[PDB]
Design a protein around this ligand. Sequence first.
Ligand SMILES: *[C@@H]1O[C@H](CO)[C@@H](O)[C@H](O)[C@H]1NC(C)=O
Ligand SMILES: *[C@@H]1O[C@H](CO)[C@@H](O)[C@H](O)[C@H]1NC(C)=O
Ligand SMILES: *[C@@H]1O[C@H](CO)[C@@H](O)[C@H](O)[C@H]1NC(C)=O
Ligand SMILES: *[C@@H]1O[C@H](CO)[C@@H](O)[C@H](O)[C@H]1NC(C)=O
Lengths: 880, 880
Amino acid sequence: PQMGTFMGVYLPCLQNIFGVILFLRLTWVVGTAGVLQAFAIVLICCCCTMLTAISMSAIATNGVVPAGGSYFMISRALGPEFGGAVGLCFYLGTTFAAAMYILGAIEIFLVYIVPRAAIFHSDDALKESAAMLNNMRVYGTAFLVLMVLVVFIGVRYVNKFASLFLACVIVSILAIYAGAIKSSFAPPHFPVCMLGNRTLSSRHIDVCSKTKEINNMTVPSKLWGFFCNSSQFFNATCDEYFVHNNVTSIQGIPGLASGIITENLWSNYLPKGEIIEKPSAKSSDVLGSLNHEYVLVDITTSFTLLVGIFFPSVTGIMAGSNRSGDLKDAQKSIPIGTILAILTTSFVYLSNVVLFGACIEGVVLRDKFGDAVKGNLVVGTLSWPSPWVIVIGSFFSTCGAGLQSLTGAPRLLQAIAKDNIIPFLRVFGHSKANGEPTWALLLTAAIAELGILIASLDLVAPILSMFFLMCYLFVNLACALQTLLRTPNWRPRFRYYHWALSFMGMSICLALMFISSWYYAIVAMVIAGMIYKYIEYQGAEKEWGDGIRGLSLSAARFALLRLEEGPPHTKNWRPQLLVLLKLDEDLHVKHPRLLTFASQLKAGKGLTIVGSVIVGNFLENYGEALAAEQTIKHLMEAEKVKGFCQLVVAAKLREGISHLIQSCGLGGMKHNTVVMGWPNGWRQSEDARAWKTFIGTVRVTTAAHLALLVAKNISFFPSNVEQFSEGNIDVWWIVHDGGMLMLLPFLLKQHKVWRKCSIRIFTVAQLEDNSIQMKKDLATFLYHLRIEAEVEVVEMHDSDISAYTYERTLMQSNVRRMHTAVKLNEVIVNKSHEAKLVLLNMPGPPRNPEGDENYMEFLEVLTEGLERVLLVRGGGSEVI
Amino acid sequence: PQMGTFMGVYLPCLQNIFGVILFLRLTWVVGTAGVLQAFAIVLICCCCTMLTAISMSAIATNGVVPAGGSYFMISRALGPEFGGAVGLCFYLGTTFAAAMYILGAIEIFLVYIVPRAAIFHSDDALKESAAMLNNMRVYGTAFLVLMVLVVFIGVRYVNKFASLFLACVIVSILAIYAGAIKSSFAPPHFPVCMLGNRTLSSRHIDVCSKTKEINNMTVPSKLWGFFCNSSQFFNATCDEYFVHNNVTSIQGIPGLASGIITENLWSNYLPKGEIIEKPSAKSSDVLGSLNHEYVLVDITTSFTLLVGIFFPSVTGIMAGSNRSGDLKDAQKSIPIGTILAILTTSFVYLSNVVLFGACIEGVVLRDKFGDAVKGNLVVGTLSWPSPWVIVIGSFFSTCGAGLQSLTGAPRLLQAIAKDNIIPFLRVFGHSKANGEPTWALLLTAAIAELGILIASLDLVAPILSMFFLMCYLFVNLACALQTLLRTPNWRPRFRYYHWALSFMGMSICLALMFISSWYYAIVAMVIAGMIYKYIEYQGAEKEWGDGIRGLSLSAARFALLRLEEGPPHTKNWRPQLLVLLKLDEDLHVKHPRLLTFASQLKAGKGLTIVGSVIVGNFLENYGEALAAEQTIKHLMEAEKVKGFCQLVVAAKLREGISHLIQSCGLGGMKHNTVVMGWPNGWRQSEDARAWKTFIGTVRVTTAAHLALLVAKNISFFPSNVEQFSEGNIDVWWIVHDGGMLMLLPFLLKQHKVWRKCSIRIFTVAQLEDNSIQMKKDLATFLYHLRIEAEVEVVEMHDSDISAYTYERTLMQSNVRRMHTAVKLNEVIVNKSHEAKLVLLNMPGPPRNPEGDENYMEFLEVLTEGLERVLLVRGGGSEVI
Ligand SMILES: *[C@@H]1O[C@H](CO)[C@@H](O)[C@H](O)[C@H]1NC(C)=O
Ligand SMILES: *[C@@H]1O[C@H](CO)[C@@H](O)[C@H](O)[C@H]1NC(C)=O
Ligand SMILES: *[C@@H]1O[C@H](CO)[C@@H](O)[C@H](O)[C@H]1NC(C)=O
Ligand SMILES: *[C@@H]1O[C@H](CO)[C@@H](O)[C@H](O)[C@H]1NC(C)=O
């Protein structure tokens, strides 16, 4: 239950990074690329996996850190959509890792431990490619089944013997560094033999000279047998290169004392079949083609090739947090414990590339399989007790790392199958009584089987470096997006984190990807995308019922929850129309001209809600309401309205109209303003209370602080077919109106019906001077990008607007308003009679209930027979 | 006003496809790639631009076809977001097209018309690269300014002389095909001179022989001067290749009579500097390095290179619909008129590649600049009247095509600047009184300037083929997506259209892209994406006010409008919770345990609405309602509810509860079911009407056909902290219940509080036998993937459920129900006393108003002291 950072998340991490590649291909990377370009591989590979440990640390700090495995930390903190992608690529990469580790174990056993037994002997000098490949196919499968049966049965022992496998590593890594300081001031004896700039394989021949001093008869040596025709007299019919050159035996370990970095420095990339030349020896250019017993370039090499080969040496960081459920401070361990394991595995890798180039001669650094040093490991030469310490040691370490890599594949595939997120793999979840599978173990054995039929570590490693790069990409991608877009419930409370650092790791992992193999690279990213979306589809067929419509519902809810963070009043104002249509008996809209006019503002634009009310007794007329809404649905689509319908069968009219103002639009998507018709047959029989319901709407919108745009003379409104040409539009400004009265004429002219019309700004002045006040307007037109308007000032008497300045200070006398209604309308018609639309301000209604006539006869004079006029007013807005 | 298909959309299309490439590089494509691989370029280029004409035809048929230019057809029918991308790439490609056409005009004038005048003479034998390049920089700019001033001033003439430019084409294309049939049975005289497999430039030398028969003294010829040391005696110190070989003069036009396709067939790709060898001649391998007067490979060639060079020969299909506003049947023209122009331009291109290989010798087909045929155009040899007909003709045609290509760039950039969609380029919109710019013409002159500083047709053409491929990609991409995703207002009423055909064109245009130049390819697609999104951002800062929040609002509305197409009842059922909380004075929630329980079903899941009502007089207590909703907001987030709030200050309680059931959730996002508390202190003082408001909710949900889940004993509900372990959960089945009663226990166990609990299915049987009825259940558990439940049947008497079968047939006696309430509850407690939750069915309420007690004392007995029980009922659902 109680673990620590050291033995909890550091040692299982450091177990799963040091492995075969430090022993089996590292010096070959050192010798081929030189010091400098092999120095360039490791820093582009270590910093590829440092940045992922940072992005995983932000997953570590943020969240709850669920107990058990790293995958649940990856799944719960990024949504299950990425857990399908990152959880699956790390599966496939781990299955090859068990195959690559077991392939390295056969390679060292068949070369170094037992070179003698080989079931597929080379039948000729060039069968060595096929003979070695056909070894690795028929051998590792014989040891693959052994591995699977002991992870199926002896799973108790392998949990116990994990300390020895790390112990096999730790004694094997020191012995390099111990024997390294020994060769300084005391190099051991490992002679190599040379002939010309090229050299020769020293396997069978013991002593190298052109002759052989036998006690009384100096014979030509075995080299004469391996270069001339036969083993015979010292005579002709020999080579042209062996004759004109001489046999040289030099030291392959010149120690740290020599200057080697300055000479063994440059790139040595060669095509396949090239004989391993030394850059400093004497040679006679006689050009023999004599390839019997030599040393060659085994496969063709390049710089981009060695990156895809070296890269599985650094992998295994997701195994650093496999024991999260046993920790005590997991939000503090997983950043600290893992990155410090990265810093100690980069320190080893950068050291030995220097330490190999400064102590071992570069010609045997190109030598694969230790062929010039008589089947000794090139690392093992630098081992102070014995090479057998490393050879038996590095055999066990890649054995146990393969023993480790089978536990995870079987375990992980249950965790996705128990997650039930893909129904294709529901069958894999059937575990035993103790958490071991029989189907995931069948899948892991079958996928790792294909790597043995590849039968070469230098072709498995580029494929294996692909899948781990697919995970390390989508870890950095998902950490960057949720930090940039601010996906809800994502708070990375980590010190050393920034969003662009995962973005920089997102680019490098993509740069590593195409450079390896491009037609593998595209098919990797495309098969990743369609499995990603197939998660997102099957979220809908579980949660929102079924179908493809739920994905739009899910994306709707995922958007609507986002606006609940901030305030809706941050910067700007736009009208979002709630219109409401009165319905008589045999229910039809009383005035569709609003629904024309509403679309004559926000055509193909924002939130539009149509309002509607039916009176009395919801309990039976519901099917009528199902029928009445369809009338509007085929009426909104007729007049190009892309909006939403709301129909309520309330009891009383005053109740429904109050409700739809305060209860339309869920959540952050709210309507912003109300557009309403007019009680037209006003001074009539019974509708005086219905007139007061029109008054009752006004005091609602003041209390709800929502703008109101009520139309007058509604039948005389232009349809959506006809157009207008050359009619003026007037606003009538008061300083408390706001930028609606500026913005609303601008929104009108964008529609084609109100296109060819002129704008006459007829402002009402209450102050004295106009020139600064007209400058105040012309400043706004330079600000509001709508300088097409033309201004004109009027002012008569500030007592004639005592109906308005009484409200402005609040920002008989009611009879004193009614004389001033007539006097102001005389001004309006005399400058704007033939107006195709008028914009008038709607004043503040009285707080008194018997200010009903005191407000409305004042307004019916204020509509002194005008053609088209909107009475507007709004509250608390900003237009920038 | 009235145009036709022929002279309207066909001839302006056919004008803008035939151009320079048929005359200046086509034969060089024929000679280099052979017949077969040059045959492969044209079919991957013609079918690249056929499929775009189909996808443009679906834009042509669907929609209104606005008058004026192709861009408005592209913009209005795909949203303005793609019109930023497709409208801009077609601008940049057109600017280079004016530069590439004018560069070809200088090339033919400086080689073929006037070879004599050249301001930058070659100072040595290898200055020919730099001298020719420095010609094209200093010449075309002198003719660039001439082109700009006449499109600025003489724009009236160039509208008139467009018929002559097509007339320059049509007489020039026939003269190939006229002179082609002439060389069959009557080839003209165009001799070529050969020496070995290689050959020589025939510019200066007239007659070729190793000597020169002067009337009485046969001198060694000029070739002796161009191969040996000097012009001297017939002696030594000569070449080793000219001496051992001989001068051969053969025919370069062997006509259609010879078998040439069978011999001139294979690929002739050579590196730069290679001497043009004939594959069939006699040669002496003496290896001179004598490169004075020869013929060479001018630039290095490859198959992927010639595709990016040939491709601007097929471009110009967006100019096929530039005159849409003058048509009469534009929805029928633009499919028919354009594709038939594609069929007649593919017919020419495929013919001449055959006709060149079957009539002209392949060695002069590799010959650029007509150097072996004494500065004659290789096409012009096949011209029956004169080569000067083609040479003057193809000069004028690429002149007028360059004269055309300046009108569009200036015109198009206004149309985007008048669209105001990018504020960075608002300044470009300032036209003159007649639609000509001064800033777009400044931008078009400056962008085309850079191509002249490239000064080579074979480097401009790969860059020019990039931008036109960027448009032809995003045309096919946008046509495929809106057809697959079904974006609203997208109905392609075209015959010969399918969605995958634009998808196949989407792949090929992307295949053409990376193969040209990959590091140009990525930077093209990335600078396309961020300009695309920058349109989508600035839609929000104009429409939804401002900010980045409007993009989520816009994506919300774009999703909510989509569900208005189909029915919500297509396949499946899921609960979408509307919960409602009663609020007393000093307003707090009476029972938060619902809000625990609601999240104990849909945790991190779908639509959740909380319901709430305040009584009386909205006109002043609005700030309280602003305060009361914040109580719930910090209460829903406390109990892990990601849902939405609705608060109404209504008058009476019955009015508000009826309203929020029928008016919550805008549009397609509707709540599906109601969860409600219980009138707990039931038989008490005043709340009998408040009890009937609880009854009043029941008859609402029947009429609205929405499911109801009312909880009993609400204080005895487990919180979200505690857990449960080993308690049974019972449902109680009636055949008219529905799969809710099956699905609801399954939804409970997924939460961790209801995790470790058992499921006992206690069904109520009304029939006789149970074995088939239990088989009917076990069939459902095999169907519903939830076989963890365990069943048990009861049946006593069907008269004891006369309270239910009276309702089932509808799918004293009220007192006769009340005796049967006691008898059924005896069954419930005797098998399910220690139940941590009970699921009971809620029966149908009476239609009579005085069935108030007749329904509820029957139910209060039905909750005979049980711990936790939900009374559920729902109507008209499907669970699959
Ligand atoms: C090769 O080595 C021999 C020593 O046996 C020496 O005599 C001879 O000069 C050498 N040849 C060279 C250095 O070319
Ligand atoms: C060895 O010598 C040959 C000629 O003797 C030379 O051309 C070759 O480059 C040399 N090899 C090296 C320097 O690796
Ligand atoms: C080259 O041509 C001459 C004709 O002047 C002929 O005599 C000679 O044999 C030819 N050489 C060949 C075909 O190798
Ligand atoms: C011409 O002849 C040389 C040798 O005489 C030959 O190697 C070369 O391939 C020939 N050129 C061709 C066939 O194009």
